[PDB]
């Protein structure tokens, strides 16, 4: 859900990285800040990586998985790691748990044995994964403070596509708009916008910034609108926000091909230094 | 947790039995109240049965399972069925789920594979049970309204045993008191007292009513006390409550040996009439 700033989210993850290190040295298990630990910065990379990995999983998922489920799963994952160190709870498990919790809260009819079946491994490997999800379900639920309700952009998105193709029937061919805006939603999802802005003023930013990329512009759409342009009363707020967001996607640096393998390597060193 | 009355708990389970029947005829799936359905009365029997069955499971559990866990598991189970029909969610699964949720919220270090291992069946049968628990965990959590914190009598019990053997050192041999009071706690647990009275004024009722059964009586214990006698300010309330409770255990009729097999038989007829 929407927080105040990006620094507020940076301090949160900091407190989570810190808190684990202290309670790591809290059994003389590790040299007071020895090379085993990851920096908050090294945590985010791994998470960016695992969310990317979450999206892939969700895309090949059979039976076809709804946009909202995937979107819900991403939020659980992001919000968990705002207060938990990846050195404590592994993201491969927590992402998978996030997906399962999501299929469940969303009432997306899928059975755990059908869920786990999308994993690329042996029948026992799949079952093991299932057991691990069981292990972490209450925890994830607890870490999200029992608030499992998540509102996605998908709904508002379809709202604006209806509105636009209606006010502008030349754009009755906005089924070209859709794909490009989709491409932009997926990119923005990977950022902290989910935790920082409304899914409405997020979906708006997808339609508009896509149409525009495709040359078109409706000089009076925002003069008009769909549910208060489904965003900030003052047009200005709306405008700098779509700017901010377009910025967020612009500064986004994807998980490093190599850093990830080293970080994955460090991550296990914590999962072997025996709780350190 | 403590409700107002026993009729309030009877109406709740009624609304749960009713609500399922209506939404059962709600697809012409069944003759508007045909012989398939169970009566609230037939629901309670099955639940009494399954809780008895829960206790057994919990008793042979390895590694040894704490008093509180078992007690917690019983509450989840009772409170779930205050708003859910056994025709909708089977008690064999929900009781097992209740136990697992309990080991988890109580931080009783047991792994699902260790948990499920106490089941008397094949490795795949055990795994299946594990999958089923996964299926129902969020639901149980949702049905308890996210309130998983449960206070047991065990703590207050040990409080009064400390108090009594202290004020009366002839009763420094109350480790005879313990067993008989334990016998009485287990009996009272099987009733709705858990949902109707404080675990303190429940534990008190165990000590006192046991000591008394063993002839002894401290004519001034309640004149004195352990944490406000850990119960009602007015001694009277305290006294009729211990009466009420001693009554609850007195009118308790255990699940019928034969009715259970027929009811179990009916229960599956609902689990085959395809949601009816």
Swiss-Prot record, chains A, B:
Source organism of the structure: Homo sapiens (Human)
SMART domains: CYCLIN (SM00385)
Family: Belongs to the cyclin family. Cyclin C subfamily.
PANTHER family in the cross-refs: CYCLIN
Modification type Phosphoserine: residues: 122
Keyword Nucleus among record annotations: yes
UniProt keyword list: Cell cycle, Cyclin, Nucleus, Phosphoprotein, Transcription, Transcription regulation
Gene3D superfamilies: Cyclin-like
Transmembrane segments: none
Subunit structure: Associates primarily with CDK7 and MAT1 to form the CAK complex. CAK can further associate with the core-TFIIH to form the TFIIH basal transcription factor.
Compartments where found: Nucleus
A GO term for molecular function: cyclin-dependent protein serine/threonine kinase regulator activity
Gene Ontology cellular component list: CAK-ERCC2 complex; cyclin-dependent protein kinase holoenzyme complex; male germ cell nucleus; nucleoplasm; nucleus; transcription factor TFIIH core complex; transcription factor TFIIH holo complex; transcription factor TFIIK complex
Record's keyword annotation contains Transcription regulation: yes
Protein name: Cyclin-H
Physiological role: Regulates CDK7, the catalytic subunit of the CDK-activating kinase (CAK) enzymatic complex. CAK activates the cyclin-associated kinases CDK1, CDK2, CDK4 and CDK6 by threonine phosphorylation. CAK complexed to the core-TFIIH basal transcription factor activates RNA polymerase II by serine phosphorylation of the repetitive C-terminal domain (CTD) of its large subunit (POLR2A), allowing its escape from the promoter and elongation of the transcripts. Involved in cell cycle control and in RNA transcription by RNA polymerase II. Its expression and activity are constant throughout the cell cycle.
Primary location group: nucleus
Swiss-Prot/TrEMBL GO biological process terms: protein stabilization; regulation of G1/S transition of mitotic cell cycle; regulation of transcription by RNA polymerase II; transcription initiation at RNA polymerase II promoter
């Amino acid at each position: 859900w929407t927080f105040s700033s990006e620094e507020q989210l940076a301090r949160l993850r900091a407190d989570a990285n810190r808190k684990f290190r202290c309670k790591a040295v809290a059994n003389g298990k590790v040299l007071p800040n020895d090379p085993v630990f990851l920096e908050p910065h090294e945590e985010m990379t791994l998470c960016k990586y695992y969310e990317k990995r979450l999206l892939e999983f969700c895309s090949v998922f059979k039976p076809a998985m709804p946009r909202s489920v995937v979107g819900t799963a991403c939020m659980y994952f992001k919000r968990f790691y705002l207060n938990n160190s990846v050195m404590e709870y592994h993201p491969r498990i927590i992402m998978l748990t996030c997906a399962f919790l999501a299929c469940k809260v969303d009432e997306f009819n899928v059975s755990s044995p059908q869920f786990v079946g999308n994993l690329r491994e042996s029948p026992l490997g799949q079952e093991k994964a299932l057991e691990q999800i069981l292990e972490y379900e209450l925890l994830l639920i607890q870490q999200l403070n029992f608030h499992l309700i998540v509102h996605n952009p998908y709904r508002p998105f379809e709202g604006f596509l209806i509105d636009l193709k209606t006010r502008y029937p030349i754009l009755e061919n906005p089924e070209i708009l859709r794909k490009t805006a989709d491409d932009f939603l997926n990119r923005i999802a990977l950022t902290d916008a989910y935790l920082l802005y409304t899914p409405s003023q997020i979906a708006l930013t997808a339609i508009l910034s896509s149409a525009s990329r495709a040359g078109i512009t409706m000089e009076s759409y925002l003069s008009e609108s769909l549910m208060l342009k489904e965003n900030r009363t003052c047009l200005s707020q709306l405008l700098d926000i779509m700017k901010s967001m377009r910025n967020l996607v612009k500064k986004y640096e994807p998980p490093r091909s190599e850093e990830v393998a080293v970080l994955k390597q460090k991550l296990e060193r914590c999962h072997s230094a025996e709780l350190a």
